[PDB]
Paper text:
Among them, a new [name] [name] belonging to [name] hormone sensitive lipase (HSL, EC 3.1.1.79) family (family IV lipases) was produced and biochemically characterized. [name] unique feature of this enzyme is [name] presence of a cysteine residue in [name] [name] motif which surrounds [name] conserved catalytic serine. Three-dimensional structures of subunits of wtPMGL2 and its mutant variant mPMGL2 were found to be quite similar (see Methods section). Both of them had a typical α/β bacterial HSL-like fold, consisting of two canonical domains ‒ a CAP-domain and a catalytic domain. [name] active site of [name] consists of a catalytic triad of conserved His302, Asp272 and Ser174.
To unravel [name] effect of [name] unusual Cys173 on [name] properties of wtPMGL2, two point mutations were introduced in positions C173T and C202S resulting in mPMGL2 mutant variant. While Thr173 wasn’t forming any hydrogen bonds to [name] adjacent residues (except for [name] solvent molecule), [name] side chain of Ser202 participated in two new hydrogen bonds, one to a nitrogen atom of Ala303 and another one to OD2 atom of catalytic Asp272. For unknown reasons, despite [name] same conformation of [name] loops 202–209 and 216–237 in both wtPMGL2 and mPMGL2 structures, a PEG molecule was found only in [name] active site of mPGML2. Each subunit of [name] asymmetric unit contains one PEG molecule bound in [name] active site cavity mainly via hydrophobic interactions. Key residues which participate in [name] cavity formation are: Thr204 and Ala206 which anchor PEG molecule by hydrogen bonds to its oxygen via their main chain, Gly107-Phe109, Thr173-Gly176, Val178, Ser202-Tyr208, Val218, Leu234-Thr236 and Asp272-Ala274. [name] presence of two different PEG molecule conformations in [name] active site cavity most likely resulted [name] inefficient binding of this substrate analogue. In contrast to wtPMGL2, in mPMGL2 [name] Tyr208 has one distinct conformation, resembling [name] one [name] [name] [name] of wtPMGL2, which allows binding of [name] PEG molecule in [name] active site. Interestingly, PEG molecule was found in [name] active site of mPMGL2 (but not in wtPMGL2). This finding makes mPMGL2 [name] a unique example of family IV lipases with a bound ligand analogue, besides known structures with small inhibitors like PMSF.
Author numbering:
A (entry chain B), B (entry chain A): 14 to 332
Write the structure that this text describes.
C-alpha cells in the first residue's frame, strides 16, 4: 500500500538511503527453517553492530545477575556524574526468537553512549524453546539484582519491537513479585498489547488492496512465545488492562510512522493519559518498525536523544 | 488508499456511525464558487452546533475586546472553582475563509463544558477579504484584553485545522508585540507549518495509486490567507523555524490517525521536544481531520478530556 507513496518528504537524504538498503536487505522466505532464520538475523545484527561501532565508543562486559546472562554496556568515556546512580535495563527485539548478543548490543550501545549511562542488556530466554512468561522472569531477576545497588526510581527499562512487548510484561511481573516499580520505561515499536488499528494493514502485515478481502486483525500477538495466553491475561497484555495500565511507570512510546505497531502505540498512549500515567509518544514519519537499529541517519540520532531525554527527565538521581 | 481498509478496529460503534455521517456531509464540487462554498459550510457548522447543544449545556455572550468581536462560552451554571482564574481563547477553523459564528461555537462549547472554563472564541478576519497577519492581529488584540483580568500563565489558546495554524501564528505575533507568552496552546489538526510527510497522500488531499503520478507536496500552505508569505517568515511558519520553536509555550498537538495534518504534527512534536518545550501528541487511529467537531462518539468526549486535562495540568491557578 505504502509503495504507491514517495518517501516521506520529512526525511534526510541519509534516511532515504537507509530505506533503500532496508528494502534490499529484506529476508528471503525461511519456511520454518529456524536455524537458517537465526543465521540470517545473526548476520543482520552483526552488520548493524559494525555500523554502531563506527558511530559510538562503548565498552561491554558480560555478567550474570540472579542466574541471568547480561551484557553491561557503558560509554568508553565513562558514565556522566549525573548518571552515576542510574541504570537502564535493555530488552532486545528479534521477534521473540533471535537478537541475542549482537542484537542486544545494537539496542544498548547508542543509548549508553548518547545518555552517558550504564545499560544492562538481558539475554532472556527465547521462543520457540521457551514461552511466556520466561522473558518476564529473566528481566525481573535482573531488575531484582540491580535494586541491591540502585533505587527503583533510578532504574529504567526499555526495549524495541518484541523487547518493547517484554518490557511492558516485565513491569507487571515485577509488580506480581512485590518489587517496587521501575522509575520509567521505553516501549519502542511495541508494548503489552496486540497490533491493532490501521497500521498493520498499511505496513502489509495483513494483505489488503484492490479485489482483496481484508480480514479482521487478531486480538492476540501471533508469536509462538505468546501461544495459548489469553487476551484476558492482564499481566501478558497490560496496555489492554485498566488495572495494569494505572500501575505503569512513566512511559516513552516511540515508533516509525510506517511501523505496523504505531496504531497500537497511539491507543496505548491515550489509555496511559486517561489513567493519569506520565507518557510521551513520538512518531518518525516515513520510517519503519525499529528503524533506529540503523544508526547512519540523523533520525536515529534524534531518536536516541529522545530516549536519553525521557530517562534523564523521569529517573531519580540520588543514591 | 484508505477506502481499501476496514474502519480501524479500535473505533467504538458510535465512531463507525459518525464516519458514515461524515461521508454523507462531504461537500460537492464548487469550482471556486466561494459564495456556494460558504453557504455549504454555514449549514455544516449549524448542523454540528445542533449536535453540540444536545450534549452540552452552555451559555454564550457576545462581547467586543480591543475592537474584536468574540463570543464568551461558559458552562450554563458557571465556571468551576478550579478555573475561576483561567480562560481559554479559541480560534475556529474553516479553511481560513468560513467558520465564523456557529463554527466557532462548535469548537468552544465542548471544551467550555468539559473543562468547566470560560472560552473566548475570536471572530477573526477571514480570507480572501483579509490576509495574513490579520487573524494574528485579531487574536493578539483579544489576548491583550484578557491580560487585564488573567495572568498570562493562566491563559490558553487553542484552535482546530486553520485555527491550529492561526493559534501558532498568534503566539509569534504576541511575542512581536512584547507581550508575555500564553501559558499553553492547543494546535489541533494544524499548526504553524505546511502539511508534509505521508498523511496528505493517505488522506487523499493529493491523488496516489495505480495509474496516478503522485506529486511532491508544497512547502507553503496553499490558502489565499497565506498568498505571497514566504516560507522563511518564521512568524508565519514557526514550527519550521528552530528559533520560533524554542520560544513556544507548552503545546498539545491532537489529530486523527487518518488526518492529512498528522505527519506534520508528529514532526512539530519532535521539534518541540528537541527544543525542550513541553509538548504532548495524541492520535486517534482511524479518524479524520478535525473529527471532534462531531460530539456523538466516545472518541470525541475522550479528545475533549485530553484537551481539558492538558490545559488543567499546564495553566497556572493563581489569581
Ligand atoms: Cl506526548
Ligand atoms: Mg541475588
Ligand atoms: Mg502528560
Ligand atoms: Mg516532555
Amino acid at each position: 500500500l505504502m509503495s504507491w507513496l514517495p518517501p516521506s518528504n520529512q526525511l534526510s537524504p541519509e534516511a532515504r538511503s537507509v530505506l533503500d538498503r532496508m528494502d534490499a536487505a529484506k529476508a528471503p522466505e525461511f519456511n520454518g527453517d529456524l536455524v537458517r532464520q537465526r543465521a540470517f538475523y545473526q548476520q543482520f545484527n552483526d552488520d548493524r553492530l559494525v555500523e554502531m561501532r563506527r558511530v559510538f565508543r562503548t565498552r561491554e562486559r558480560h555478567e550474570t545477575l540472579n542466574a541471568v546472562h547480561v551484557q553491561v554496556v557503558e560509554p568508553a568515556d565513562g558514565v556522566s556524574a549525573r548518571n552515576r546512580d542510574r541504570v537502564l535495563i535493555n530488552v532486545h527485539g528479534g521477534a521473540f526468537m533471535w537478537g541475542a548478543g549482537s542484537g542486544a548490543l545494537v539496542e544498548a550501545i547508542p543509548i549508553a553512549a548518547t545518555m552517558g549511562v550504564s545499560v544492562v542488556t538481558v539475554d532472556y530466554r527465547l521462543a520457540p524453546e521457551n514461552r511466556y512468561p520466561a522473558a518476564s522472569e529473566d528481566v525481573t531477576a535482573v531488575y531484582r539484582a540491580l535494586l541491591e545497588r540502585y533505587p527503583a526510581a533510578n532504574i529504567g527499562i526499555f526495549g524495541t519491537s518484541a523487547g518493547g512487548v517484554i518490557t511492558a510484561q516485565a513491569v507487571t511481573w515485577i509488580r506480581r513479585e512485590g518489587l517496587p516499580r521501575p522509575g520509567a520505561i521505553g516501549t519502542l515499536s511495541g508494548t503489552g498489547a496486540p497490533y491493532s488499528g490501521d497500521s498493520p494493514y498499511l505496513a502489509g502485515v495483513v494483505p489488503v488492496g484492490p479485489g482483496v478481502k481484508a480480514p479482521p486483525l487478531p486480538g492476540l500477538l501471533p508469536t509462538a512465545y505468546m501461544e495459548g495466553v489469553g487476551a484476558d491475561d492482564a499481566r501478558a497484555y497490560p496496555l489492554t488492562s485498566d488495572a495494569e495500565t494505572v500501575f505503569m511507570p512513566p512511559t516513552l512510546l516511540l515508533a516509525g510512522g510506517r511501523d505496523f505497531a504505531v496504531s497500537a502505540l497511539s491507543l496505548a498512549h491515550r489509555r496511559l493519559a486517561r489513567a493519569g500515567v506520565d507518557s510521551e509518544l513520538h512518531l518518525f514519519d516515513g520510517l519503519p518498525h525499529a528503524f533506529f537499529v540503523w544508526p547512519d541517519m540523523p533520525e536515529s540520532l534524534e531518536a536516541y536523544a529522545l530516549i536519553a531525554g525521557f530517562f534523564d527527565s523521569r529517573l531519580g538521581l540520588t543514591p
